[model samples]
Target chain A: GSHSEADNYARELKREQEEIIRVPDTEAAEVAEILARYGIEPHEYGPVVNALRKKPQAWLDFMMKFELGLEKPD
Target chain B: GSHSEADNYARELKREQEEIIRVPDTEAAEVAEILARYGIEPHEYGPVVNALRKKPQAWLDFMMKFELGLEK
Candidate 1:
């Protein structure tokens, strides 16, 4: 049935995505640590970084949310 | 001399830039408010936003520095 074919199609997409997005253990851990310092959960960073890392433009967009504030009074 | 030409060059550039890149008064004020909440100075943001607003790619590059954390 088309449903089974559609399921297989999704599998190919999953397989292709995995092939392209390389999540090295150490780098993922480093990104996790940075996120943790900002109160973000460590486990969540991997997927977020992995997803954004796929596209340079997307990664750049996601970076804008960080607060790289200049020195200011307390 | 190039130095003399360069001085005039910057003047023209400043004039050309204002025409090409706009900082709408209300929008600048709004961005000022948002940046101020994050401890950024309202005065400083004017030049920074105005500069980046000129070049399309520079604007995108500047946008990436923010931390958009996800749900845990």
Candidate 2:
């Protein structure tokens, strides 16, 4: 019962991330540029790329944070 | 600005995740057990480990998930 808020938060985080994965091509190039700024890549296909399949939700969390454009220094 | 609420949520998410990383050892082991279930480790330091350093919020995001005991 108490899992409602956190559960919904978790699911929304998950769902929107899945939604973000559909990065457009031109922007994917831009995203690659941005991701490289963080020393990763266009879509986070990092060393843990294959491992990510096993760690789906965690991966989505990372991706959504990336999409937030928070990578730039404050 | 319009960024207040979303910005607050993101920052709060970031803050708690940092707090979660200071795991105690016994639970660190528990974390390890859970991580291995995901095929990672007590500490994620995943293939994207170095990359994560470049992406702090993302790193925190994963760790918070671990702390949430969501991996089990």
Candidate 3:
């Protein structure tokens, strides 16, 4: 038997959610580094990093997009 | 004189920040739609949408990444 698409999605989402919650600061730092590539200054990262740290899921989504170059299936 | 690279970045970031703050709910809806493409059920969207709504900047970042395929 094989896993359905929905089931795979469920598992991946769950793993990502937990990782975001567990290592928020680590994720936020990576996001800051990602922004640097876009020309975000070191000093200017405070507000951006702060905003991301407060939202775990969004931080993960940002990482998945920028760091991994993965988008939500569309 | 033409804008420097730093100046362009500054202007874009400022514009994006203001836009995120000004129309948060609208942006959040777009994020939900993006997630839907990933097979996120309508019911599954409530939590994700709610989380994003509380962080306007994050919502914008998410939209940029997913909807626009433009990450920040």
**Which candidate should be chosen as best, given TM-score against the real structure?**
3
Q: Residues B1-72, candidate 3, lDDT per residue (tens digit)?
A: 787766765666677667667876676667667645433455655555665666556665665555555534
- Clashing residue pairs in candidate 3 (N, C-alpha, C atoms within 3 angstroms): none
Q: Which ten residues in a row have the lowest lDDT in candidate 3 chain B?
A: B35-44
Tens-digit per-residue lDDT, A6-28, candidate 2: 55446666565555466433333
**Candidate with best lDDT:** 3
Report iRMS values in order: 14.5, 7.0, 10.4
Give model 2's TM-score for chain A to 2 decimal places: 0.36
Question: Looking at candidate 1, what is the lDDT of residue B37?
Answer: 48
Query: For model 2, what is the error of residue B18's alpha carbon versus the real structure, in angstroms, after optimal superposition?
Result: 20
Chain B TM-score of every predicted model: 0.38, 0.34, 0.63
Q: Rank the candidates by TM-score, best first.
A: 3, 2, 1
Q: Rate the local accuracy (lDDT) of all candidates.
A: 0.41, 0.45, 0.61
DockQ comparison, 1 vs 3, better candidate: 1
DockQ, each predicted model: 0.05, 0.12, 0.04
**Model 3 agreement with the true structure over A1-74: per-residue lDDT tens digits:** 76556754455667667777888777777766765543445554555566566666666665665566655564
Winning candidate number (DockQ): 2
For candidate 2, give the docking quality class from DockQ: incorrect
